[PDB]
Design a binder for this molecule. Structure first.
Ligand SMILES: OC[C@H]1O[C@H](O[C@@H]2[C@H](O)[C@@H](O)O[C@H](CO)[C@H]2O)[C@@H](O)[C@@H](O)[C@@H]1O
Ligand SMILES: OC[C@H]1O[C@H](O[C@H]2[C@@H](O)[C@H](O)[C@@H](CO)O[C@@H]2O)[C@@H](O)[C@@H](O)[C@@H]1O
Length: 341
């Protein structure tokens, strides 16, 4: 009843800084997005951070070993066995440092780490192959590196930005630059966004091993509408694909995207999280992803948050629930998922 689940993947962000470690409050300070249809910047002061909520751990650094210890203890409380790490191909010493610290901290608690491959500049199947080789070579022998039946696993955000004819070269067994049957073979999980008429042939022709949905906001896409999950799972099973639906506790991003209020999803003291997690389990899936551990900008985090009012903003909080409620409610749902496996 307390063991970690290694079919539960929680999306984790390593881009936060503090004065203590980095010399700068990175990401707590953030540009405000212009409306797609001179917006300014959130300064990352104690009073004004780039979130509608306020972390229990304050304006922390993702490179602070003491913060990382606490985060791994939170994963243990939630029973979430896999940390799905955002990866932007920064190619700098700070990226390399933080990945190594995260792997070391995870292994102390028997947590595993996989990579979430983001839409970095000029991403294409050739530099993706080179980067998959780099990550497996650098980190594949670390004891915390995740494998499922011998294979690493990668999530690919906004995979539709690359044509299926390009994906086939990397992911078909006959592809020109294939990883299949090589030392670098891996489970590749693409993003299902829109309707089945578009997504079914995309996923088949790209040769993905499976698909996920990402968005914590119900109805944002066809794929993030949970009443579609039973039929998506049936299609996955008939076609030998792994479906990993994404569940989250709520959504609100209006500090950084003030024009995006129609995407707000209220937490209702945990009832929103309960409804989404129940739908994933009832669909009969073999793996679940959680959006998110700590995407504070988008208000999808399960990490503990505290009440806070400053001279500049009155933050949202988890009241009438306690700061660790979303960790303990995740553990409840992991138990119900395991009962169904
Ligand atoms: O939310 C601000 C954040 O947006 C973009 O990153 C995305 C978000 O973190 C979220 O939607 O999840 C995506 C998948 O993990 C991720 O791409 C970036 O523009 C980022 O720079 C920005 O801070
Ligand atoms: O516009 C804000 C929005 O940006 C991102 O979503 C975009 C894209 O990445 C998604 O694939 C499609 C799905 O239809 O929607 C947008 O174009 C996300 O960061 C999202 O959370 C955010 O609200």
């Amino acid at each position: 009843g307390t063991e970690l689940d290694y079919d539960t993947f929680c999306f984790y962000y390593d881009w936060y800084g503090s004065e203590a470690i980095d010399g700068q409050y990175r990401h707590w300070a953030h540009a405000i997005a212009p409306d797609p249809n001179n917006p300014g910047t959130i300064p990352g002061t104690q009073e004004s951070i780039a979130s509608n909520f306020y972390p229990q751990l304050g304006r922390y650094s993702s490179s602070d070993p003491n913060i990382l210890t606490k985060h791994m203890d939170m994963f243990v409380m939630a029973r979430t066995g896999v940390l799905a790490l955002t990866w932007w191909n920064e190619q700098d010493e700070t990226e390399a440092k933080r990945i190594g610290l995260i792997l070391d901290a995870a292994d102390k608690k028997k947590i595993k780490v996989c990579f979430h491959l983001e839409p970095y500049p000029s991403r294409n199947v050739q530099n993706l192959r080179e980067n998959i080789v780099k990550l497996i070579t650098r980190y594949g022998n670390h004891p915390a590196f995740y494998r499922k039946d011998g294979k690493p696993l990668f999530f690919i955000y906004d995979s539709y930005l690359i044509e299926p004819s390009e994906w086939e070269k990397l992911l078909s067994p006959g592809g020109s630059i294939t990883i299949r049957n090589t030392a670098y073979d891996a489970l590749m999980i693409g993003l299902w966004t829109s309707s089945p008429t578009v997504q079914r042939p995309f996923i088949l022709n790209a040769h993905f091993d499976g698909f996920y949905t990402y968005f914590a906001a119900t109805g944002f896409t066809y794929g993030s509408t949970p009443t579609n999950w039973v039929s998506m799972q049936k299609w996955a099973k008939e076609n030998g694909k792994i479906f990993i639906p994404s569940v989250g506790p709520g959504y609100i991003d209006t500090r950084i995207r003030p024009w995006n209020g129609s995407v707000i999803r209220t937490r209702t003291d945990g009832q929103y999280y309960d409804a989404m997690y129940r739908k994933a389990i009832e669909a009969g899936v073999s793996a679940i992803s959680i959006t998110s551990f700590n995407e504070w900008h988008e208000g999808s985090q399960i990490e503990p948050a505290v009440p806070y009012t400053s001279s500049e903003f009155t933050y949202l909080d988890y009241e009438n629930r306690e700061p660790d409620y979303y960790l303990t409610r995740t553990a409840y749902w992991v138990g119900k998922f395991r009962e169904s496996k």
